[PDB]
Amino acid sequence: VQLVESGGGLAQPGGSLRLSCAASGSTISSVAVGWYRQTPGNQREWVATSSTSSTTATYADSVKGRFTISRDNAKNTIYLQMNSLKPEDTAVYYCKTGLTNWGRGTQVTVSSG
Amino acid sequence: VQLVESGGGLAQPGGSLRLSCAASGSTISSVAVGWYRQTPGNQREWVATSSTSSTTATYADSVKGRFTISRDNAKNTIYLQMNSLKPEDTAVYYCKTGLTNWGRGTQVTVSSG
Secondary structure, eight states: OEEEEEOOOEEOTTOOEEEEEEEESSOOTTSOOEEEEEOTTSOOEEEEEOOOSSOOOEEOTTTTTTEEEEEEGGGTEEEEEEOSOOGGGOEEEEEEOTTSOOOSOEEEEEOOO | OEEEEEOOOEEOTTOOEEEEEEEESSOOTTSOOEEEEEOTTSOOEEEEEOOOSSOOOEEOTTTTTTEEEEEEGGGTEEEEEEOSOOGGGOEEEEEEOTTSOOOSOEEEEEOOO
16 A cells, blocks of 8 residues: 655645645555655654544644545545645645555645745 | 535445535635535435634534535635445535525435446
8 A cells, every 4th residue: 555645836825735645555445544744854743634434534733724634535545635825834745654655745835936 | 605516426335526615706715614415305404514713624423434525715615525425425415604595506416327
């Protein structure tokens, strides 16, 4: 089971972006998948964890009410919907489970230009 | 402020569908938006309510862990992501706030063919 991030890009403050975490090798319908983020020279952080059958999704304090994790089982993909973007959301975003690599991640840049 | 539903269609059991609720006339970034559903000759039901700034999203018992509401503020749109579809999810789905009409709704058909 491997996970590939995409969908990151440039946004303005207040903007929206949806990140994708595409699974291969197995199905992620039943497993908790985490989103994490990091800026160079700073600590990696937890962002959110998807629901399971026995658990609801959870979110880091700084993103509560702004981000939403969702799944598309048919596409074997986990999303991170981002809204109300802030310059401090600028980071490389990674999806992972305890059994996967961190991955290449996807870069998000929230900028005034 | 008016809301238009789309994205409904045919799915197999276990399938996935994402419904869209597109707003016009105003922005829905700060307001709670509900999803509801109904089959002909049966009672309309509540399905889920979106988050606000002071409230987390909530879900009806029969859809918990299977559906997820999310927003795209840039598109002024609310989604209902559906997974693990069941024949009983067959219904016309409506989005609404206390200040809108029910709308034309969008039909979802979960079928064996």
